[PDB]
Design a protein around this ligand. Structure first.
Ligand SMILES: NC(=O)c1ccc[n+]([C@@H]2O[C@H](COP(=O)([O-])OP(=O)(O)OC[C@H]3O[C@@H](n4cnc5c(N)ncnc54)[C@H](O)[C@@H]3O)[C@@H](O)[C@H]2O)c1
Ligand SMILES: NC(=O)c1ccc[n+]([C@@H]2O[C@H](COP(=O)([O-])OP(=O)(O)OC[C@H]3O[C@@H](n4cnc5c(N)ncnc54)[C@H](O)[C@@H]3O)[C@@H](O)[C@H]2O)c1
Ligand SMILES: NC(=O)c1ccc[n+]([C@@H]2O[C@H](COP(=O)([O-])OP(=O)(O)OC[C@H]3O[C@@H](n4cnc5c(N)ncnc54)[C@H](O)[C@@H]3O)[C@@H](O)[C@H]2O)c1
Ligand SMILES: NC(=O)c1ccc[n+]([C@@H]2O[C@H](COP(=O)([O-])OP(=O)(O)OC[C@H]3O[C@@H](n4cnc5c(N)ncnc54)[C@H](O)[C@@H]3O)[C@@H](O)[C@H]2O)c1
Ligand SMILES: O=c1[nH]c(=O)c2[nH+]cn([C@@H]3O[C@H](COP(=O)(O)O)[C@@H](O)[C@H]3O)c2[nH]1
Ligand SMILES: O=c1[nH]c(=O)c2[nH+]cn([C@@H]3O[C@H](COP(=O)(O)O)[C@@H](O)[C@H]3O)c2[nH]1
Ligand SMILES: O=c1[nH]c(=O)c2[nH+]cn([C@@H]3O[C@H](COP(=O)(O)O)[C@@H](O)[C@H]3O)c2[nH]1
Ligand SMILES: O=c1[nH]c(=O)c2[nH+]cn([C@@H]3O[C@H](COP(=O)(O)O)[C@@H](O)[C@H]3O)c2[nH]1
Lengths: 333, 333, 333, 333
């Protein structure tokens, strides 16, 4: 008898992938109210954040202003790599000189990326993010391993992005201090349309965590978070932090100017694989509603997270990571 | 082999949650026609209603005018608690002086809520509703138990809201005279977006009833009812009454004035967790179509319920609670 | 362990109901081309149609003009019962005098319905349709049995509507010469919203056929057919004929006049349970695009059916009833 | 106990059919970057293409200009058969005289189709495509066998279209040099609405490949490809090439003129079963956005395919055919 969806191979369709909108967190017994919840969580093996949020390494999201504001809000920014090495290293220094704030910076793969990494380390960066669409490529695993052996106890090395248990395991073996998850889910991502490739993000987190948690390696959920409720869902699936692009792109601190249209305000937001950022693009150029100061956006996001922690009876993010989901049907939206 | 939706824990995604739109009632053998159906049902252990409908404890739904009209229609109102204690107690007296009509009133948790409760009991209220977003919080279970031990044979004590079997069981153990179900489903609810928390309402009722029915405790289905057909579905899932917000907010008797727009009439309707009602809000402020007199709305809702009773062969609500569902696909809408 | 959708009763959600849009017919080996297919099929035990289509007993679909045109096209009309007995009987005579054409007529339940039935039989009707929303009501089963024992070898007696195997079996036992299926699916039906009751139509046909086929009783699929492809699907699920309302309401022969709007033409179409037709209505009043002559509409519908017969390798409707489905996902629409 | 979807036959609903939008390709371990991927693949047993793309045999897609451009781009065109034999044969000669480019041409079934085929072979065509809606009809299998025995080592003979394992197996037995898959999926196809017949295309490919691959016969995925990502999905499901209609209809090289509307440009695109092309039509007449030169469209499509190959670690199309899918939910779109 055939597999009900076709052919005779039961592993051809390997999984059923759930995204954020497919699940809700179940309320549970609680002695936690939103006010008493503790939102701190590991970004990497060595680095703990007060607020488990990181801004995306995108040229419409994180330059020094955003990185400073994120660190002051208890999270962290990852400086984007679409600018000369000297300028990126300069922005690292601008952040570190603003009171010894934490900061990360993105690098790619290869010789130029190596020079960039060494300059960032010299400028005092806390976290290097090897920042790629496909960390299961051998070249990315090599870059992560080479960085960790060279500068590994002066700096934390994050590898990404992955969407499977096997890819997460490979980054763990290469020595990553955190594993970043997300292939396909970004709001400005067209990888699913252009390449037909991706993994729904709740399932991707569940799978990456199955490799990373037994190894003591934190998982960063990256892409597709549209609402504060999604942050609670990502962390409950086992992520330790979430990386945000679109939710932060509309803020005052994000690079780019205010666009006034029809009495409404917008800001430019674009994929780092868009034509404008870079050809077969895998990102789009768009705009998002203007959201005002970063500090207030983060307060709303953390407020939603704290509500989820109270509903699930989670005093800490570590307990939130043990919460359960109910799956919902299309009618549920 | 992994769980097909991710990870190695088969209980991480604990349930598949159905909402009202996911199911239909199956017609069955019948010697009932809508005219002969008996719609009476227990609100609490001690209180039976002629019509199994309760109006929401919301400041755009139930003040004394709505409570009087609901009781005269054979149901009951629950007076909202967004007003001073003296005024809420006054409205209880206004209802009781209108012919010994049944009335309930909402209270929260804590010292002020206690003073409020004692005043309501003194004013002659029939039902206290401990009225919270999360009754599985230890503080709410304590409030329910404290009220029941103190004023428990003078007044009925309802606890809510819950969305799981374990939460319902906890309220039963605390001594609730009814258990109110609904976390996430309200029309003006943004808990699912803000906190990422909720449970689809048919599954939530089925689970709460699995704890409550063996204990002889009635379940009140609260939130997400959009159509008269949903009332029949909630009761068939095992609820004994339904609580209505949006379906009653448009009525003449609801608080608030008529809004004339484009020759159409509306009334304000808002969550009790909205900014206007209260910060990270979990409700919105909106409007609903004006619906005319409450009496006529209730006649239409009970007419739909009676039709369902005839189709399912249910002469009483107790038999309707034994009816079966067919699940439908998205194509079914 | 609970049922995954809630509670501890695996039969509470009894079925997964498929509708027409949930399935496609699988192509199969074929020596049939659309031109050679034979579309004849049993309407009842004793009556075979050349084209397996019947027009709905609705006052915006079938009066004598439609009945004459349907019979001439190789199908049949069922005259509606929203008119005096004398007038309905008169229209039966008008059809029979137009060349001994087949005709049916609807009756309800009770004394007045009985008088109506006797007059229709005297006027020479071929088929009485006991025409109700819920044939599993004991009163309807009694009417079917009483008619069959009284006038049963002069006239064929159809009973409906049902949506389950048990209801179909009950009509078989009462002596129905055909069983009509459809509770909830009609285009102008609001039973699913008002009463929350219904059964998706492919599953309803599959279940009714499981009772009717072993008893040699034909099944009429009634309601929810939107496209010619749906007729092939209904017959493949095991129905022997299909009854059409909305697909025929726009035709020249349907009662009602042409409505000109924005250079487009419409005709009124309304449920027989609508306010205008009859209170808690379970039908709506609307309009449908004007479609021109009935003869041309039937040619298009039979052409689609013949195409399906060629694709499935079915030379006759009896072989089409053995065809298989593939289920499709929401993405499939 | 009944089948959960109705009746007592577990094979009545035979399969669950997935389409392109139901799945994503899973990233895997990779030493492939888009630049190093090899996109060559078998069109037929004897013919390999550099780019695994074929243009549809439609009179709004492929005449000699499109066929020349497709062959120069490394793919192939199939000349449509809605024109006199002499003219179609002439266009074959026009292509062959443009540098010994590969070309195919469509024929139907019967005596006239035979004369057409012989003229095409004499004009030097490389591939005859027996071009029908239903190749599991005995008449089509006979045409394929007759052509292969008569002209079979001078020319390759493709048979289509099929949507099942059994139909693919029948074409293999008849001697097809490739099997073309797609019943129902075309953008301008109304077979699913008119006849109610079809098979979702990923499942159809998986099933056809289960018959064809063990026989060494290539599968051409035909219809429903909307995005470059769909090409990667079709090939991963086991197809060896993809045939494109709508994605190529907007190009400069496609037959038909530019339609200027609202400052936007369009081109006519119509099914070959549409009224205009040919009655009960199973295709529609429409328009598609103007896309510019074919060469640039093919570069974008191959770029998406190469990205998918890098993500899946596939250096060749043969390895891409071993990639795995994750199924997504409706929420996933
Ligand atoms: N999402 C919501 O906030 C929500 C949901 C349902 C109803 N309401 C309505 O809003 C009004 C205020 O209700 P409320 O419960 O927000 O009032 P509240 O602030 O008075 O809280 C009362 C008690 O409920 C518990 N609680 C509430 N939310 C919690 C959470 N996220 N985590 C842990 N415990 C929690 C706490 O024990 C708290 O002491 C009421 O009228 C209620 O009917 C709000
Ligand atoms: N939802 C609907 O009301 C509905 C559905 C299908 C067809 N129709 C059409 O509307 C017209 C009136 O049909 P009707 O059946 O409402 O007529 P009706 O009022 O004449 O009822 C006839 C019999 O059907 C049974 N019945 C009908 N609805 C029932 C219910 N909810 N519960 C139990 N028994 C019920 C009763 O035995 C009743 O005596 C007919 O022409 C019919 O074709 C209505
Ligand atoms: N739904 C459609 O009609 C459809 C589907 C795919 C492609 N097309 C395109 O339309 C054009 C005409 O194709 P066609 O196959 O309609 O041409 P056609 O009328 O020339 O038929 C050719 C042969 O296909 C078989 N066939 C076709 N439809 C059938 C059915 N419903 N049942 C049984 N056998 C059937 C018959 O054996 C017939 O002799 C072609 O260019 C084709 O590519 C049409
Ligand atoms: N779909 C996308 O292109 C995508 C996805 C996520 C993030 N981004 C962002 O865009 C920017 C560029 O990222 P990038 O990875 O495209 O940069 P890149 O071109 O610098 O590639 C870096 C390395 O990633 C690997 N890689 C990337 N795409 C691959 C594929 N399709 N197949 C195999 N290996 C592949 C290769 O080893 C490559 O050497 C970054 O800022 C990143 O955050 C792009
Ligand atoms: O497929 C992609 N193409 C792109 O061009 C692109 N640019 C950024 N990113 C990724 O998207 C994340 C931001 O996602 P959100 O806007 O949903 O927060 C980021 O954090 C990245 O992981 C991309 N992904
Ligand atoms: O999540 C929520 N945020 C809020 O601000 C809010 N206010 C009311 N309620 C609840 O909603 C119920 C009314 O729901 P309906 O409008 O769907 O009838 C009510 O009966 C309550 O249970 C809220 N829920
Ligand atoms: O629920 C209902 N309320 C009504 O008022 C009503 N009127 C007709 N019918 C039924 O609908 C069938 C026609 O359906 P279509 O328009 O989909 O063909 C008809 O053939 C009937 O079975 C009704 N059903
Ligand atoms: O059902 C159909 N009715 C038609 O009239 C018709 N014309 C073409 N085709 C088929 O559609 C394919 C093109 O599909 P796309 O536009 O989706 O690429 C083509 O390659 C054909 O397989 C038809 N199918």
């Amino acid at each position: 008898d055939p597999v009900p969806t076709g052919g005779d191979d039961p592993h051809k369709v390997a999984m059923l992938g759930l995204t954020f909108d497919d699940v809700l967190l179940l309320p549970a017994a609680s002695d936690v109210v939103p006010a008493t919840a503790d939102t701190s969580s590991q970004l990497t093996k060595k680095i703990r954040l007060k607020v488990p949020l990181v801004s995306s390494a995108m040229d419409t999201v994180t330059e020094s202003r955003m990185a400073i504001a994120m660190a002051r809000a208890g999270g962290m920014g990852v400086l984007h790599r679409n600018l000369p090495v000297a300028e990126q290293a300069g922005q690292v220094e601008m952040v570190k000189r603003s009171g010894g704030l934490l900061v990360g910076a993105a690098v790619g793969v290869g010789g130029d990326a190596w020079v960039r990494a060494m300059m960032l380390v010299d400028a005092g960066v806390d976290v290097l993010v090897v920042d790629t669409a496909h960390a299961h490529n051998r070249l990315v695993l090599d870059m992560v391993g080479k960085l960790k052996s060279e500068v590994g106890d002066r700096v934390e090395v994050v590898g990404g992005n992955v969407a499977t248990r096997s890819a997460a395991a490979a980054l763990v073996d290469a020595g990553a201090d955190a594993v970043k998850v997300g292939v396909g889910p970004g709001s400005i991502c067209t990888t699913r349309v252009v390449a037909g490739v991706g993994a729904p993000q709740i399932t991707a987190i569940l799978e990456a965590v199955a490799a990373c948690r037994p190894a003591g390696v934190p998982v960063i959920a990256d892409g597709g978070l549209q609402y504060s409720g999604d942050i609670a869902k990502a962390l409950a699936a086992g992520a330790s932090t979430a990386m945000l692009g679109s939710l932060l792109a509309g803020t005052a601190e994000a690079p780019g100017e205010l666009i006034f249209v029809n009495g409404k305000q917008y800001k430019s937001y674009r994929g780092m694989g868009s034509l404008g950022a870079m050809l077969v693009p895998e990102g789009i150029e768009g705009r998002v509603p203007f959201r005002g100061p970063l500090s207030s956006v983060i307060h709303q996001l953390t407020g939603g997270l704290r509500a989820a922690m109270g509903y699930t009876g989670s005093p800490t993010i570590e307990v939130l990571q043990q919460a359960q989901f109910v799956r919902i049907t299309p009618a549920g939206l």
